[PDB]
Design a protein around this ligand. Structure first.
Ligand SMILES: CCCCCCCCCCCCCCCCCC(=O)OC[C@H](COP(=O)(O)OC[C@H](N)C(=O)O)OC(=O)CCCCCCCCCCCCCCCCC
Ligand SMILES: CCCCCCCCCCCCCCCCCC(=O)OC[C@H](COP(=O)(O)OC[C@H](N)C(=O)O)OC(=O)CCCCCCCCCCCCCCCCC
Ligand SMILES: CCCCCCCCCCCCCCCCCC(=O)OC[C@H](COP(=O)(O)OC[C@H](N)C(=O)O)OC(=O)CCCCCCCCCCCCCCCCC
Ligand SMILES: CCCCCCCCCCCCCCCCCC(=O)OC[C@H](COP(=O)(O)OC[C@H](N)C(=O)O)OC(=O)CCCCCCCCCCCCCCCCC
Ligand SMILES: CCCCCCCC/C=C\CCCCCCCC(=O)O[C@@H](COC(=O)CCCCCCCCCCCCCCC)COP(=O)([O-])OCC[N+](C)(C)C
Ligand SMILES: CCCCCCCC/C=C\CCCCCCCC(=O)O[C@@H](COC(=O)CCCCCCCCCCCCCCC)COP(=O)([O-])OCC[N+](C)(C)C
Ligand SMILES: CCCCCCCC/C=C\CCCCCCCC(=O)O[C@@H](COC(=O)CCCCCCCCCCCCCCC)COP(=O)([O-])OCC[N+](C)(C)C
Ligand SMILES: CCOc1cc(CC(=O)N[C@@H](CC(C)C)c2ccccc2N2CCCCC2)ccc1C(=O)O
Ligand SMILES: CCCCCCCCCCC(=O)O[C@H](COC(=O)CCCCC)COP(=O)(O)OCCN
Ligand SMILES: CCCCCCCCCCC(=O)O[C@H](COC(=O)CCCCC)COP(=O)(O)OCCN
Ligand SMILES: CCCCCCCCCCC(=O)O[C@H](COC(=O)CCCCC)COP(=O)(O)OCCN
Ligand SMILES: CCCCCCCCCCC(=O)O[C@H](COC(=O)CCCCC)COP(=O)(O)OCCN
Ligand SMILES: CCCCCCCCCCC(=O)O[C@H](COC(=O)CCCCC)COP(=O)(O)OCCN
Ligand SMILES: Nc1ncnc2c1ncn2[C@@H]1O[C@H](COP(=O)(O)OP(=O)(O)OP(=O)(O)O)[C@@H](O)[C@H]1O
Lengths: 361, 148, 592, 333
């Protein structure tokens, strides 16, 4: 053979002190896995999915989930195959009947004007799409063909009704409407009414109201119990600090959404020192509500990593009154300005207030 | 290695030149086929180097582990730590084998792919050569060289 | 397919091959091959008529497309454990079998007869369709999904469920077991992410060292149970390995034997193609009739040049896939043999005594070389084991049909290859003898300079570098003479490797014209022989290495068996801490 | 004998409604009943509805031509009411063409007979109505989302163990698909034949169970499998579940109902499971499932329901309050 290993001996030579690998060791600062990306699109990949066909059993859910160019291919194939499946039926029936023979029409043809498979294909188009040119009629002298005309119509009606239903659920898709719900790139932590809070701005771009809005906030962090648990991605709900406790919001202008950091909050011991890039912290914000046009509920998912938090900064005013109405200058949507704030944690802020209160009294 | 490396690439050049000369229609399809050959010859070297580096660096701890067990056999049995050291051997041996299994698979991945390409050449070369022996009248002489 | 563009569950999903996964693929590939033959016959027959006659091949051409999808459709139902969709597949086999059989029986009514190829292929298709039908029914018998109230569902194997297993060769579709398709993702990943022990994940259960060691012990335990033999000799080990790894070694041989036979299809196709092109008369064509469709016969089918090229293309795919699969089965068994022997040797290290008569003889270096040298040469033997069973077959089959191709002069020329092979064994043996002289001398010089590079400060502050360097140079000269001898023998090895086939052809063709002159050496015969020499040179000039490895392997097992029955730590099978009453200790096993 | 289940492991409430004073409410909701039918059964009603409709008017067209004298053998002097009607088979084919709107036109509707014009009007109105009825039913069948609940997954058996001192009935629920269930919700109920001090006997009393959410609500965000636990405080009905009486023939059951609108179609769905007494393992935790990759997380659904042994007291949660109170009181002094 033309290989250097054609004949080799049992070789073993002591490569003494084979050290200094000089590995790049770049995995330390490779990436920080995100729970949900900045535009929804949850960045979680499942493994060992023991599917029992339930992936495809939800056919009509799957068909809607597919992109439009894929839907056009399935729309085309589902009809082209149906036309061509019965094209072979009409061609074969007229073959077996014997009116396919190019001769004098002594008999009465099973389906008139069927001369070639091309005519058999065109007649299949006419029956299923109900064009019915009438050059290729269905004669009464073919009891087998009458059955197929019944079958093709029922299959043609059944395919159309199923395909129309899939399209209507795709026309009512509102995942594109949820992309006009905007969250600021970076959320800020600043004092409001003497209490620290985690502020945030969320805005709606389209003029169509999103009805029954409902905003949720959760902290994603690894949690170890006193009993020594290992919870990799623990989700702790965060109150919206709404005046009535509920999550309901009215989104016309870009609203400020903040979480009052009381003693019951998971962010109760966050300092600006521990807000670096590789910090085990993430805030998930989920805005729900029914789109007023299609009536279909939507979600807008955004997340803030630790390096996407901005301690001690304030959101600039956005709404300014004009001559006849108000005005939202979206250019200043995410602009932040520094604010005079303590650099201590919430616990220290409560503790400092507690000591001051005792001294005053 | 240098003698066999040059002979390997020169035989490929020698073979490809003769096939192209016998059937000029072959080189029309050689360029689309050569590009696929390049990518197979591209990704393989990246993996083959890494596997071969993993092949060698994984068997050095294995031989040393055998040597150290022979050096201090009395101590290991004294601590009753031979249960753990056998488990280390299985961890040392399994890493050595799985590094070699992937190296073998990489060679087998290359060899199968680089022989379906060769098989596709044979059909393309035979098809054009037979047709050119019926119309351009190759007289079946260069056809045989186009096949062997 | 549209969903697969946005499917994430298939990122690490598991599978469960249905009962009959292997019998499905082997039939499908056979079915695909015969459908190509029908296409070849169909296009062959219609060339004589003035009309196209599309019914000869297009029904078969549509079958080939349907057969390909029938296994793509089946595979998509195999990865997703949803057997219910096999009803559509089941209907196809039931429907195709019934319609094809009606065609087959109607040929017999018109008395087509086996003398017509279309009757043979149609009859063959009935069997292939029937057997594929039984495979689908056997799925229902074991899965019990259509009618039976309680389905006997099957779960993916436990070793596959691990996220830490990435060598998925043992469990993939039979086409990926042959073409190694699953490696494509790993190879692409190597370009972006460098390959470390992270990428190379935990090996499967079948190839785990502990699993192999259990099978080797069972092979030993059953050997000592069925047979009551006191010693554990070389033959005891050889019979042990065959029991624990024969069922895979035979599979490697089966692939190699078939790939060796399919390799000669090339020379036969070259002989067939050119011989048809060595005839001026191409106006003549197959001519026999039953209705006017002009059924073609067997000999006329294998006379068309294009038919043989297509059959050559199909044969080449089989040969080059069986041959590669033969390597993997042999190699994987070899790696497992190493895995189960390293554990056995290491397990012997724990159970061996520390007597000065024992441990003062076999130093750590002696037992280290046993793992490195002795095991690898035994491990490499299991790599080349299929060769010695098949290379004689390939050479004999090569010699048998090379006699028919050209005559006697081919055997006279080929004898030069056979006669000069024993000298090549001498060259290779003399190559290794010169190699050990360099190997022993390199270690002496490398050990000498190790002292030089260890006390360098005393060797540099005392200005001893010039004096000590001269010792390395002088030792190198004694080393370099040995390496020059090795370079000579490896240079001669290349010459005999490459000049003998040229000498074989030179003697063959000139000898044929001069001594024999029995023919004109047409391209049909001459160029068929050139391929045979290329096919025969590779086993002829590498069989020496197979024998040499077998000789080395016999020493390794002999050496391994001698070590494996040495002194052991007795009394293992059988209050104050140090309680000793008599304490008649000893080191010799008996007395002293 | 056997122990009944209120709801099976895959929903499917095992309650038998009996002595129903049926006022025909089954048939009054034809449109709702039509959707509830299986797909093979729908085709039969779909097929027989059209096939009867064509055949109902096939008799009408044949009778009209018979009365008009059109089907009299021979080329009569009269103008045919509907052309080329020379058999009931021709009448059947013409019936199909009008209602399906194929309209080949070898069998036209002439201007002579006014009765056929009315029947042509009637058949078109019936054809449009029946087609409109069938389109609506199929649209709601294509918008069905009960099969989506089949991809909502719960662990085989839940656990009761320690977490932040207190005792919580943990659980695990996972979503296999990639689409989201907007506005998810979890309701947990304990079903037990509960008596009352007043003397009442409730054969199956359903008491709601808090989900121990961060904001004291029901909303959950289901992307990776989560732990739906319930802190067993003084008000929890499970406050007196000893490990001793966790055996098979214990009147105990935890219903878990996961609700939320499917993002693809907007249809709300429910996923229901019940954990019997023998399907709760005291003092076990759930294994960590979410691993980390180079730039993403990784859920090992092989380890979805695996539980490991964890040390815990083998005493009731009621005895945990007493044990803590005594220890706290002793430490105070
Ligand atoms: C790894 C690579 C993966 C690649 C996957 C993608 C493959 C794409 C194939 C490229 C060719 C496709 C041609 C399609 C032309 C019409 C569609 C078009 O112009 O786009 C307009 C869009 C589709 O855009 P999108 O961003 O993909 O939408 C996804 C959607 N927003 C979603 O995700 O949800 O669509 C719409 O907004 C829908 C309007 C439809 C109305 C138009 C009528 C056309 C009907 C069909 C006509 C052709 C018939 C041909 C018959 C041939 C018979 C022989
Ligand atoms: C107890 C009743 C049993 C009835 C058995 C019928 C046997 C028919 C034999 C003909 C071959 C077809 C194979 C069908 C196998 C049986 C049906 C079946 O299970 O479908 C599989 C799936 C989803 O079903 P499921 O929810 O898992 O049902 C459970 C099971 N059927 C049961 O109830 O026990 O279903 C699907 O996945 C259907 C795919 C539809 C795709 C729609 C696309 C739109 C275009 C439609 C027209 C395309 C043109 C081609 C027409 C056919 C398309 C499939
Ligand atoms: C009329 C005929 C004309 C010519 C056409 C013929 C086409 C037919 C193809 C025949 C191929 C035959 C291969 C048979 C071997 C199948 C694999 C096999 O048996 O081993 C499978 C094994 C894994 O199982 P296991 O866990 O070890 O088994 C349990 C235990 N040991 C036991 O068996 O109890 O795993 C292994 O051991 C790995 C084995 C890998 C095998 C790979 C072979 C792939 C071949 C692909 C061919 C390429 C395409 C050719 C088709 C051409 C068509 C145009
Ligand atoms: C004169 C001839 C006219 C012929 C007209 C045929 C028209 C065919 C149109 C071609 C495209 C049709 C595609 C539709 C297939 C979609 C099926 C699908 O995705 O779901 C599969 C489902 C399984 O769920 P279910 O238990 O029925 O759910 C009930 C629920 N309440 C619901 O309505 O979602 O459904 C199932 O269960 C399996 C679905 C298989 C589809 C059935 C095809 C025909 C079968 C005929 C034989 C049936 C015999 C058995 C009858 C029932 C016995 C219990
Ligand atoms: C997109 C699609 C349009 C496709 C149009 C036809 C394509 C094939 C062309 C062809 O030769 O068709 C032939 C049939 O051919 C068959 O019968 C083929 C059957 C295959 C099934 C359909 C394709 C899958 C047409 O020939 P024929 O029907 O025999 O013609 C009648 C002969 N006479 C005129 C003498 C009476
Ligand atoms: C003809 C055999 C060639 C291959 C032999 C080796 C495989 C034997 C193992 C076996 O049980 O075969 C198969 C049963 O399949 C049957 O039992 C088929 C019976 C078909 C009946 C047809 C009647 C005619 C099992 O399927 P498999 O393909 O071996 O599955 C591999 C499992 N793995 C890939 C998940 C690891
Ligand atoms: C599904 C059918 C499509 C295929 C039909 C093939 C058989 C032909 C039926 C047929 O001619 O029926 C005949 C009887 O039969 C009836 O009048 C049947 C009445 C019951 C039909 C519905 C059954 C359910 C109709 O007879 P005619 O044609 O009205 O006979 C007089 C007309 N002529 C003498 C001018 C010819
Ligand atoms: C790394 C070694 O793992 C392998 C192991 C095998 C099996 C095998 O018989 N090998 C020896 C043969 C003997 C005579 C040395 C060999 C080595 C180098 C080059 C070619 C060959 N012969 C292969 C068979 C046909 C004639 C030439 C194949 C291929 C490989 C491989 O590199 O993937
Ligand atoms: C002459 C010899 C020829 C041999 C050829 C036959 C073997 C081919 C096997 C293909 C295969 O097995 O591949 C399939 C490819 O599928 C598609 O892309 C969808 C179908 C698109 C086209 C309709 C399915 O596998 P997959 O999509 O990688 O599986 C993930 C889902 N679980
Ligand atoms: C699809 C699965 C594999 C197909 C294998 C094809 C084998 C054909 C063997 C015969 C041959 O190759 O025949 C020639 C065929 O050429 C064509 O027209 C190309 C057909 C392309 C087919 C897709 C005709 O030449 P001829 O036999 O001398 O007939 C001349 C007088 N008419
Ligand atoms: C030159 C010879 C002619 C045939 C050429 C085609 C060979 C295909 C090999 C099939 C195979 O290798 O089939 C699957 C690969 O699928 C694909 O992606 C096919 C893409 C095909 C692209 C044309 C393997 O999938 P698996 O290992 O079962 O993966 C389980 C979970 N999926
Ligand atoms: C039938 C087998 C023999 C085929 C002979 C030729 C081999 C290559 C063609 C087959 C193929 O398509 O293989 C490609 C090889 O893969 C690479 O390494 C990337 C190369 C990108 C640049 C070329 C692509 O496969 P993939 O997309 O990585 O497969 C996973 C998704 N199925
Ligand atoms: C021990 C005795 C020698 C045995 C030689 C090895 C035999 C190999 C198989 C036969 C062969 O190779 O068959 C030839 C065609 O190839 C195939 O049919 C390959 C199969 C394709 C399958 C995909 C027929 O050619 P022939 O009839 O000999 O032609 C010249 C004669 N006038
Ligand atoms: N990898 C998986 N993919 C899909 N479903 C899963 C997976 N693992 C578990 N399930 C689902 O979880 C439930 C049972 O989970 P669990 O692991 O606790 O039990 P199990 O013994 O694996 O279940 P079973 O034998 O019913 O499949 C079932 O509804 C099962 O379908």
């Amino acid at each position: 053979m033309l290989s250097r290993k054609g004949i080799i001996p049992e070789e073993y030579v002591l490569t003494r002190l084979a050290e200094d690998p000089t590995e790049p060791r770049y995995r330390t600062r490779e990436r920080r896995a995100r729970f949900v990306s900045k535009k929804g699109n949850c960045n979680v990949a499942h493994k060992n999915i023991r599917e029992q066909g339930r992936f495809l059993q939800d056919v009509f859910t799957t068909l809607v989930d597919l992109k439009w160019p894929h839907t056009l291919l399935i729309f085309t194939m589902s009809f082209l195959c149906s036309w061509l499946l019965f094209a072979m039926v009409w061609w074969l029936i007229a073959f077996a009947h014997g009116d396919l023979a190019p001769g004098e029409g002594t008999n009465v043809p099973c389906v008139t004007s069927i001369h070639s498979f091309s005519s058999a294909f065109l007649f299949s188009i006419e029956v299923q799409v109900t064009i019915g040119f009438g050059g290729r009629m269905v004669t009464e002298e073919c009891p087998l063909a009458i059955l197929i005309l019944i079958v093709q119509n029922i299959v043609g009606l059944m395919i159309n009704a199923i395909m129309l239903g899939c399209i209507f659920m795709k026309t009512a898709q509102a995942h594109r409407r949820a992309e006009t719900l905007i969250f600021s790139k970076h959320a800020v932590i600043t004092l409001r009414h003497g209490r620290l809070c985690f502020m945030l701005r969320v805005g709606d771009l389209r003029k169509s109201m999103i009805i029954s809005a409902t905003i949720h906030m959760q902290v994603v962090r690894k949690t170890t119990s006193p009993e020594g648990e290992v919870v990799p991605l623990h989700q702790v709900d965060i109150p919206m600090e709404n005046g009535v406790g509920g999550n309901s919001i009215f989104l016309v202008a870009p609203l400020i959404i903040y979480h009052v950091i009381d003693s019951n909050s998971p962010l109760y011991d966050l300092a600006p020192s521990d807000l670096h890039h590789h910090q085990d912290l993430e805030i998930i914000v989920i805005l729900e509500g029914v789109v007023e046009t299609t009536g279909i509920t939507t979600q807008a998912r955004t997340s803030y990593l630790a390096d996407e938090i901005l301690w001690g900064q304030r959101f600039v005013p956005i709404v300014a009154e004009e001559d006849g109405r108000y005005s939202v200058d979206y250019s200043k949507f995410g602009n932040t300005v520094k604010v005079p704030t303590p650099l201590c944690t919430a616990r220290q802020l409560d503790e400092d207030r507690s000591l001051l209160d005792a001294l005053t009294l | 290695t240098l003698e066999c490396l040059s002979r390997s690439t020169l035989l490929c050049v020698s073979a490809l030149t003769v096939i192209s000369y016998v059937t000029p229609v072959f080189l029309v399809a050689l360029l689309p086929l050569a590009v696929v050959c390049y990518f197979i010859q591209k990704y393989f070297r990246v993996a083959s180097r890494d596997l071969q580096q993993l092949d060698d660096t994984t068997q050095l701890p294995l031989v040393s582990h055998f040597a150290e067990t022979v050096e201090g056999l009395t101590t290991i049995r004294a601590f009753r730590y031979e249960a753990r050291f056998q488990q280390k051997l299985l961890e040392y041996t399994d890493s050595n084998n799985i590094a070699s299994l992937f190296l073998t698979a990489a060679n087998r991945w290359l060899e199968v792919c680089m022989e379906y390409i060769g098989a596709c050449v044979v059909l393309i070369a035979a098809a054009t050569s037979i047709s050119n022996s019926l119309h351009r009248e190759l007289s079946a002489g260069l056809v045989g060289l186009g096949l062997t | 397919w549209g969903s697969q563009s946005s499917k994430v569950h298939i990122h690490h999903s598991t599978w469960l091959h249905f009962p009959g996964h292997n019998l499905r693929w082997i039939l499908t590939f056979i079915l695909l091959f015969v459908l190509v033959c029908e296409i070849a016959e169909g296009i062959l027959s219609d060339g004589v008529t003035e009309s196209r006659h599309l019914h000869l091949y297009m029904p078969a051409g549509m079958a080939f497309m349907a057969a390909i999808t029938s296994v793509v459709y089946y595979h998509n139902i195999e990865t997703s454990n949803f057997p219910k969709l096999l009803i559509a597949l089941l209907i196809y086999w039931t429907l195709a079998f019934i319609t094809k059989t009606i065609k087959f029986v109607k040929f017999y009514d018109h008395a087509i007869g086996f003398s017509q190829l279309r009757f043979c292929l149609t009859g063959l298709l009935v069997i292939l369709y029937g057997m594929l039908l039984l495979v689908e029914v056997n799925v229902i018998r074991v899965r019990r999904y259509i009618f039976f109230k309680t389905p006997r569902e099957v779960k993916p194997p436990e070793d596959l469920q691990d996220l830490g297993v990435r060598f998925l060769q043992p469990f993939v579709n039979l086409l990926s077991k042959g073409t190694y398709w699953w490696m494509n993702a790993f190879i692409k990943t190597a370009h972006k992410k460098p390959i470390d022990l992270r990428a190379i994940a935990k090996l499967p259960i079948a190839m785990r060292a502990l699993t192999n060691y259990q099978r080797l012990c069972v092979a030993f335990d059953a050997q000592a149970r069925k047979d009551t033999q006191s010693p554990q000799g070389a033959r005891a080990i050889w019979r042990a390995l065959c029991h624990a790894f024969g069922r895979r070694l035979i599979l490697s041989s089966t692939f190699r034997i078939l790939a060796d036979l399919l390799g000669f299809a090339g020379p036969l196709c070259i002989f067939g193609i050119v011989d048809h092109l060595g005839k001026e008369n191409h106006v003549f064509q197959p001519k026999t009739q039953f209705l006017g469709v002009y059924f073609v016969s067997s000999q006329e089918f294998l006379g068309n040049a294009y038919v043989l090229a297509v059959l050559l293309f199909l044969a080449l795919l089989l040969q080059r896939t069986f041959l590669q699969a033969s390597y993997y089965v042999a190699i994987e068994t070899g790696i497992n043999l190493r895995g189960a022997i390293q554990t056995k040797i290491y397990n012997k290290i724990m159970h061996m005594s520390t007597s000065n008569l024992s441990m003062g003889e076999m130093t750590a270096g002696q037992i280290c070389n046993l793992v490195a040298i002795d095991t690898n040469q035994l491990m490499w033997f299991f790599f080349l084991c299929p060769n010695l069973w098949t290379m004689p077959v390939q050479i004999i089959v090569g010699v048998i049909l090379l006699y028919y191709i050209l005559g006697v002069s081919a055997l006279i020329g080929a004898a030069v290859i056979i006669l000069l092979a024993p000298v090549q064994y001498f060259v290779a043996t003399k190559l290794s003898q010169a190699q050990r002289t360099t190997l022993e001398h390199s270690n002496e010089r490398l050990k000498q300079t190790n002292e030089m590079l260890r006390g360098m400060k005393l060797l540099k502050l005392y200005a001893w570098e010039s004096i000590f360097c001269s010792r390395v140079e002088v030792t190198r000269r004694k080393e370099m003479t040995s390496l020059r001898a090795f370079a000579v023998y490896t240079s001669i090895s290349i010459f005999m490797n490459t000049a003998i086939p040229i000498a074989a052809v030179l003697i063959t063709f000139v000898g044929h014209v001069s001594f024999f002159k029995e023919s004109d050496l047409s391209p049909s015969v001459a160029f068929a022989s050139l391929s045979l020499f290329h096919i025969l040179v590779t086993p002829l000039f590498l069989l020496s290495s197979v024998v040499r490895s077998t000789v080395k392997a016999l020493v390794s097992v002999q050496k391994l068996s001698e070590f494996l029955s040495s002194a052991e730590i007795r009394e293992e099978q059988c209050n104050f801490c140090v309680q000793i009453i008599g304490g008649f200790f000893t080191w010799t096993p008996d007395g002293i």
